[PDB]
Design a protein around this ligand. Sequence first.
Ligand SMILES: Nc1ncnc2c1ncn2[C@H]1C[C@H](O)[C@@H](COP(=O)(O)OP(=O)(O)OP(=O)(O)O)O1
Ligand SMILES: [Ca+2]
Ligand SMILES: [Ca+2]
Ligand SMILES: [Ca+2]
Ligand SMILES: [Ca+2]
Length: 901
Amino acid sequence: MKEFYLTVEQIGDSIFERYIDSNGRERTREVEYKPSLFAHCPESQATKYFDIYGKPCTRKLFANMRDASQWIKRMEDIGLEALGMDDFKLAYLSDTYNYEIKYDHTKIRVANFDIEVTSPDGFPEPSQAKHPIDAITHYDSIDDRFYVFDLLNSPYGNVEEWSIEIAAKLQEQGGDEVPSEIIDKIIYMPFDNEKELLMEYLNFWQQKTPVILTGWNVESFAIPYVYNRIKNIFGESTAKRLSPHRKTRVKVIENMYGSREIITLFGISVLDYIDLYKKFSFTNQPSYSLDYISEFELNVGKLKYDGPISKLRESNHQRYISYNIIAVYRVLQIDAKRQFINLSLDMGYYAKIQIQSVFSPIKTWDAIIFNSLKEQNKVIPQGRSHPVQPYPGAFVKEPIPNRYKYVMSFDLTSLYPSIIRQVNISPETIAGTFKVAPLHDYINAVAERPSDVYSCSPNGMMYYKDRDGVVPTEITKVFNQRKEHKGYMLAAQRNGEIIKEALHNPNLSVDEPLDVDYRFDFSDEIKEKIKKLSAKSLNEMLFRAQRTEVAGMTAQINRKALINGLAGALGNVWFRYYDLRNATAITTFGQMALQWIERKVNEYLNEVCGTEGEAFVLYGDTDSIYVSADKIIDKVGESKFRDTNHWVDFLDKFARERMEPAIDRGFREMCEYMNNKQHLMFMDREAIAGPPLGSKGIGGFWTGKKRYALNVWDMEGTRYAEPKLKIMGLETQKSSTPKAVQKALKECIRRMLQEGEESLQEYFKEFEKEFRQLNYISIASVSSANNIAKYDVGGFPGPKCPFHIRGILTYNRAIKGNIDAPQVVEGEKVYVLPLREGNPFGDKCIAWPSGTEITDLIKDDVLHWMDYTVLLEKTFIKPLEGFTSAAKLDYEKKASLFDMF
DNA sequence: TCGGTAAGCAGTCCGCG
DNA sequence: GCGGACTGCTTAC
Ligand SMILES: Nc1ncnc2c1ncn2[C@H]1C[C@H](O)[C@@H](COP(=O)(O)OP(=O)(O)OP(=O)(O)O)O1
Ligand SMILES: [Ca+2]
Ligand SMILES: [Ca+2]
Ligand SMILES: [Ca+2]
Ligand SMILES: [Ca+2]
């Protein structure tokens, strides 16, 4: 097999590499890598190295890495560019793996771990590590085993061994319900003392050294806790055994408001799953506790126990250990679903970076572009300092707030990357500038043609047309991968709908789910067999179709994020290829494209409807247009349609056969106007929206920019079994809105779009009447909580104190003295509730850590003083009033002359 | 929250005769 | 009470 790296580090003048050799074996080597860097040299000199602009360079081979670094410094002291890859480990990988990496995940050791630490005096600070570590569960992907290290004797209690038989039993038998599929995979090791536990853990770690290290909050808690605890008990040298090269560094993580510390373990790649989730999941959660995220992703119940966690070990060690094991498994189950580890491996090896560098689009692209240029003996420029400067982004059209009955949307494919490719935007393809006209003049095709030679953007930039830039070349490669996966995702989604249809008529029989590849549209033979399946088989297939869809979503959306990251990196001062001329060339071209095609589509439709000056495009944002289709439907007449699906087909056919060719012609002209290298503005139909045939539903409404709802029947070729609400921006979509409130507002919108005014008034009246019964958590608002210190003045709100921060200060006064009450953590999220006048807490609101029950100390008083009226008005009525006035509806029946009968 | 811009709404503070 | 200037937070792209 072809070799591949596992990890790479620079330690002084040595590269330390762990890798898989040509026999599939894990090895480690130390290499005294001699880096090369580059300087410009005289034009008449025989060299094979040229910078990206074609200026000749001489290569400088250094005796070692420190010499190379020193040289860079002196080149700065002189005032001359020092060219080449200054991150020597990327040059090492480029040299050592000079081919497209083929990796085998089964050889990569992926460790998932979690620790427990009992603490009476509140949160066990990792940087202190003053309390014993009393449980570790470490799952190893190569052995497929959960290794459980259990402390039986502690200063906080001596306990009995954990029982695997009780762990397996149902909770109803007094057991812990550890999933039966992992019971045989547990290797249980009890210890008489913490020192033995930790020494055996290190020995284990040496034998089975993680390559990828993950878990939940491992980087901010488990890793520093374990390192510091071992450090405290044994000394530094023993703690450094967590690094396969015996090298570790305390690293300060700084943000705007302060900083924290993590431990860098050289020769390990830490991918903390909470961070993977935040980067790749495209959710925003009210809470990031493992129990909250598990429930969300997997529909598994919360891990239930009595008393505080600080007393769990002593009161119920059986459950304590079982929950530690289950916690480790829940991360594996989320990863089985989301496949973020697989994603990180793919992107990391593709770029030839340290796997953990997938968190940085700048590092990822720097390495892709460097490898690409290196293939042609080209030399990358030195990174420079730039002051941070604001620059302009997308155009968003101001919509007229209203109901909109029939709507078809269209959207440009991978816009920013497509612009890069079409225009040929790249550091080395800049050809010059032209004199810019107001954007309006380009939009209306009245400005002078920018160039007869070069490819242009309306920001004034011109680019070479003779060859592709490295940026267009490399972005195309990832775009093509993205396109493949989106295909599988969309096929899995269509297949899901076929299964949902068949579930209307499940067969009374005993059978099996079909063995199919959900990434591909079901054949006719498969569809026939489906129509004959039981509900149990069909549901199982649906679960599988939906997993396939999620896997595709992960693969496609994060490749989209990567290429969109390159367009954005051009406007980040830390990027080697930072250039506001290129960042703005992209965004400005996008503005033109949208408004250009708005004009074209209006012109096309005014023509086919025999009108003039009417606005058919009602809205647009960045790269999308929403077209009012009422008139198209009206030209046939509602009367002519058999059912909803009939007009959906008609609109689909109109968009494909009439609108899309018109849109294509408009963009080809624009390409010619701008003299671009390649026409890549492909704007396809996205949504077909409208009320159910014969209903009084309104179909859709806009309240403003980035705020709208539509009742969608077909999305990007997926024909839904049941219509789906596409709601953007509104409160149902915001993590800050209470859960029960999101749900009620969503049902109000459903009724508006699908059923009409009367149905809405029916539901509103009932919600208002019943809401005071709702569980307090479900009606709490949510907010991130920054600068609690800034606004704290002796425990009371300072000037300009934000509402949620006030709540925290209320909470802090109410729990003061209690070392054991849960603390609000700076920068994390809180639940927030308003409080009625004259309450014991002495203020108008209270907040506590999100994803938790508020401590028993005060729960009773909070429940009693909760201001339901304020809660209702703020989170429910006010947004509903916004929706309904926009839609010209009333959520309450207005009096009429009939109310005399 | 270590890892592109546009723009919405909540809330504070204060004006607005 | 509503709006503007401002901060804070959260979305849509
Ligand atoms: N998360 C993001 N980060 C950076 N730029 C973004 C992001 N989302 C959107 N943009 C910018 C770049 C996009 O090309 C453009 C239009 O967005 P959008 O329609 O969501 O995706 P897209 O057009 O790139 O892909 P798709 O093919 O799925 O439509 O807005
Ligand atoms: Ca725990
Ligand atoms: Ca798009
Ligand atoms: Ca059937
Ligand atoms: Ca879009």
